[PDB]
Amino acid sequence: RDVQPYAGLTPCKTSKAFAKREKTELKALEKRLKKYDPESAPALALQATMEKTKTRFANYGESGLLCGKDGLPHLIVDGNLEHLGEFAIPGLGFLYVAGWIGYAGRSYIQENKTASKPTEGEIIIDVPKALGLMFQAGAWPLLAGLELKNGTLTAPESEITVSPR
Amino acid sequence: QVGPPRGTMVKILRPESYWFNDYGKVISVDQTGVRYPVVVRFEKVNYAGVSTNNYALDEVEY
Amino acid sequence: TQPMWFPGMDAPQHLKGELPGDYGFDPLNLGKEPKDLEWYVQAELQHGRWAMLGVAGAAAPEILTKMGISDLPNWHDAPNYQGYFTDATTLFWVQMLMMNWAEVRRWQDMRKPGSVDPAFSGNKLPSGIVGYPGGIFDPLGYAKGDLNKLKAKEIANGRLAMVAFAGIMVQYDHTGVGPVANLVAHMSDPAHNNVFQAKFIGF
Amino acid sequence: ERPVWYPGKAPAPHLDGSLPGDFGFDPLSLSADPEMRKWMVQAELQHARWAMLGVAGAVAPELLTKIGVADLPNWVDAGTYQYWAPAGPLFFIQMAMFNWAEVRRWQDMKNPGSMNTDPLFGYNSNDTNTDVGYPGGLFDKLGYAKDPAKAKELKLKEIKNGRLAMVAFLGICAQYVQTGQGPVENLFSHIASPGSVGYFGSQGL
Amino acid sequence: MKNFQIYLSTAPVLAAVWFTVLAGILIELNRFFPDALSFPL
Numbered sequence A: 001r002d003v004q005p006y007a008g009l010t011p012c013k014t015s016k017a018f019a020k021r022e023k024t025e026l027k028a029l030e031k032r033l034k035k036y037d038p039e040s041a042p043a044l045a046l047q048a049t050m051e052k053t054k055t056r057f058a059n060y061g062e063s064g065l066l067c068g069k070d071g072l073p074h075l076i077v078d079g080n081l082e083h084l085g086e087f088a089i090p091g092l093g094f095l096y097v098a099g100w101i102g103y104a105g106r107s108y109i110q111e112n113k114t115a116s117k118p119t120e121g122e123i124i125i126d127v128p129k130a131l132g133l134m135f136q137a138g139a140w141p142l143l144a145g146l147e148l149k150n151g152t153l154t155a156p157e158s159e160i161t162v163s164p165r
Numbered sequence B: 001q002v003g004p005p006r007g008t009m010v011k012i013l014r015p016e017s018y019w020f021n022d023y024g025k026v027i028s029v030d031q032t033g034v035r036y037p038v039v040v041r042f043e044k045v046n047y048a049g050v051s052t053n054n055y056a057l058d059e060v061e062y
Numbered sequence C: 001t002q003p004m005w006f007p008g009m010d011a012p013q014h015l016k017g018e019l020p021g022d023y024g025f026d027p028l029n030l031g032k033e034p035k036d037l038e039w040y041v042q043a044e045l046q047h048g049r050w051a052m053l054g055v056a057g058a059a060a061p062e063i064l065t066k067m068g069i070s071d072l073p074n075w076h077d078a079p080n081y082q083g084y085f086t087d088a089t090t091l092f093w094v095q096m097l098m099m100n101w102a103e104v105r106r107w108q109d110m111r112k113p114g115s116v117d118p119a120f121s122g123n124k125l126p127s128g129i130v131g132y133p134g135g136i137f138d139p140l141g142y143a144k145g146d147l148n149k150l151k152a153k154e155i156a157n158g159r160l161a162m163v164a165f166a167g168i169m170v171q172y173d174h175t176g177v178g179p180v181a182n183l184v185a186h187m188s189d190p191a192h193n194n195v196f197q198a199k200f201i202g203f
Numbered sequence D: 001e002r003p004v005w006y007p008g009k010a011p012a013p014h015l016d017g018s019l020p021g022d023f024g025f026d027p028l029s030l031s032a033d034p035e036m037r038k039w040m041v042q043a044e045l046q047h048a049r050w051a052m053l054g055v056a057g058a059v060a061p062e063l064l065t066k067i068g069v070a071d072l073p074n075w076v077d078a079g080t081y082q083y084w085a086p087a088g089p090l091f092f093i094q095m096a097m098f099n100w101a102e103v104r105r106w107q108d109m110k111n112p113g114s115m116n117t118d119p120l121f122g123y124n125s126n127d128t129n130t131d132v133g134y135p136g137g138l139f140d141k142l143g144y145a146k147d148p149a150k151a152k153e154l155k156l157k158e159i160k161n162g163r164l165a166m167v168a169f170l171g172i173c174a175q176y177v178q179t180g181q182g183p184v185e186n187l188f189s190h191i192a193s194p195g196s197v198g199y200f201g202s203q204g205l
Numbered sequence E: 001m002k003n004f005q006i007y008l009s010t011a012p013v014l015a016a017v018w019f020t021v022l023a024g025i026l027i028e029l030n031r032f033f034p035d036a037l038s039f040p041l
């Protein structure tokens, strides 16, 4: 895709410095290659590395990246629609995954707190129940919203131990 | 007999207590008019590793 | 005792069975209290109705184009389509203005059916169970026959259409052609137009 | 007292001879828990039956090729044979079918009485059956389990032939790895001259 | 046997297995979808 220049950053696809970066790396690869005869396995490995570099640079060109004066891609994280894949979408993926991990943990700690000996189950994890809670934590945002609305997400002030101050 | 019966959960009100604002089972209450008659047992240990100590009648709530 | 999604085991306790569509299906226990359960019954109603409309409106331009009787665009580039009465954003703001009223009234009903027409003060709504208002909302209005059967029919058709709409959304996200075009391609070569040739050309 | 997997060694204490093909063979004590033991008896029975079917369908095409009824490839070469559908969709439908059937099997293991009535036609396999892994009414289309005296030794025969076919399939895999032909070829090659061709005979150390 | 399974269910062994599997999946994703600076669109 063709992205508009933003914050004084030209698109990497049409950036001469991006082409120079690609060129330089590829030439370095060639130099590394030259000492190896083509039949030997390092020669093929280096040619595959060159291919990988070319397709990486091409993919970065097409992915609507903005490059700077240095010639390397720069991320726009202000929320711009043209660069949402830089931070927003992977940000949403992280927020979903991290909240899943945390909610699986919270659910297991609350469930194990009802056991006869909670601290032993804290180190010897009940794998079937654990996995059940882990897969139930797929709908973490919903269940967290329910806990927030019902007031059971947060313990009241009086129950929590505090310093004498 | 004065104070909480045995077996009930009492909320600690002593500010300096490790289990302040926490709940503990009453083991026994001394009726000989001692200053801290209420023996409260705690699931969780303090920094000294003990799970119980003594409280007055006004340092507990049930 | 109701017909159950998993015949061998027993239905969950919080799923009574009288609900129009209760087949005991709740592995990840989101049901819990009845209060958010009602919030879900209504959510499922709305998702089923909106996705039935969604599938029908994403197929109908495709059916009409492929038959060749109305050269309409594909549903995915329908928003991209140009020629609407006004700018995408202009009609969007008008659209959300029109929907704010209707949906907040439904929310008021969700909160309290009794609470919720001043435009025609004579025109009211007959009192009905939440999520099934009737009256003016069903001009056909032949509910004298079976009711719970028909409600269960609506719910299961809605559930199917939502699965279908998610499926096609993924299908365009992985093929980039209309859902009926995907369908007819699978008819043409069933063993070589299936999911294995999906590539995620574009989100 | 009973015959065991190793004469002079006491059978495993968790094994009491109350299972088909029970010879006290469990040096790793992998079935000390009765709940685990139930699951594992089911695993043996399922693997046994699958290995027997595996041997039958890996031997029969090559035998028919040798006889001359029809021309078919080896068990390995059948993977790359071009069918009506590629390996993708074929396996897809196969796995859908096995999710259906194996969920029914799984819940039979959990609940023996469950999964004894047809979910689509109401046919009753066995009214209130408990023997898990042996759904006679469901699959006994010849009535070869109507007598417990007959049924127990038939169970023993099944387990023995099953274990034999598990070992046979492992041998089939190792033979194709080490030689490159189908099992039945390897068999006839060994038959022709057991002093020249065979493992340690072809100098394939 | 069962006790050994319980031993496996201990915090260190389970952490090692879980992070071994996780590293495996992440490595496989970086092999089949390599060099991903941003989510494409």
Ligand code: CLA
Residues within 6 Å of the ligand: A087, A090, A091, A092, A094, A095, A097, A098, A099, A101, A102, A103
């Ligand atoms: C390669 C990518 C990468 C990696 C390796 C990490 C790694 C980490 N991040 Mg970061 N992060 C990333 C990308 C990444 N992040 C991106 C792209 C974003 C933008 C969304 C963030 C935003 C982010 C935040 C906001 C936080 C982290 C935190 C952490 C740590 C714990 C995360 C976790 O899941 O713990 C397991 C998860 C839990 C125990 C549950 C705790 C709550 C989680 C973190 C969020 C759920 C709350 C909810 C959505 C509301 C968010 C409010 C927020 C917007 C302020 C860990 C060091 C946390 C940290 O260390 O701060 C002290 C933290 O608070 N990350």
Ligand code: CLA
Residues within 6 Å of the ligand: A101, A102, A103, A104, A105, A106, A108, A109, A125, A130, A131, A133, A134
């Ligand atoms: C049950 C999991 C869990 C949850 C939900 C939280 C939640 C929280 N922690 Mg805690 N924390 C945890 C575990 C958890 N923590 C563990 C294991 C440690 C020891 C490393 C800590 C150490 C810790 C510190 C030092 C601090 C927090 C802080 C915070 C808060 C900020 C967001 C955050 O997590 O960033 C912090 C995230 C991390 C430090 C990463 C560790 C989380 C790991 C990945 C979870 C491991 C458990 C996992 C889910 C498996 C168990 C379940 C399984 C058997 C099913 C939030 C209330 C901060 C705070 O007070 O904010 C107000 C803070 O300063 N946490």
Ligand code: CLA
Residues within 6 Å of the ligand: D164, D167, D168, D170, D171, D172, D174, D175, D178, D179, D186, D187, D189, D190, D197, D198, D199, D200, D201, D204
């Ligand atoms: C059901 C039992 C069974 C039967 C009847 C046969 C029959 C035959 N096999 Mg097969 N085989 C079997 C099991 C069986 N095998 C098993 C379990 C294996 C895996 C070890 C093999 C591996 C195998 C290979 C690789 C070869 C044969 C060959 C032969 C042929 C006889 C020639 C020869 O020297 O055999 C010798 C074969 C055996 C004695 C088989 C039994 C294996 C025992 C248990 C030896 C110990 C192996 C052990 C795993 C070594 C590793 C130790 C390590 C862990 C430290 C004949 C057709 C040869 C052939 O086809 O030539 C034409 C040939 O090359 N077999």
Ligand SMILES: CC(/C=C/C=C(C)/C=C/[C@@]12O[C@]1(C)C[C@@H](O)CC2(C)C)=C\C=C\C=C(C)\C=C\C=C(C)\C=C\[C@@]12O[C@]1(C)C[C@@H](O)CC2(C)C
Residues within 6 Å of the ligand: D025, D026, D027, D028, D029, D030, D046, D047, D048, D050, D051, D052, D053, D054, D055, D056, D057, D058, D074, D075, D076, D078, D079, D166, D167, D169, D170
């Ligand atoms: C299920 C099975 C094989 C199934 C094969 C099938 C379906 C084959 C199908 C095909 O060929 C056809 C039909 C046709 C081809 O066109 C296609 C394919 C697909 C190729 C094998 C199991 C094979 C299973 C094997 C070999 C298991 C061996 C286990 C052993 C020895 C265990 C020993 C112990 O556990 C005890 C008993 C006691 C403990 O205390 C001690 C120890 C030692 C741990």
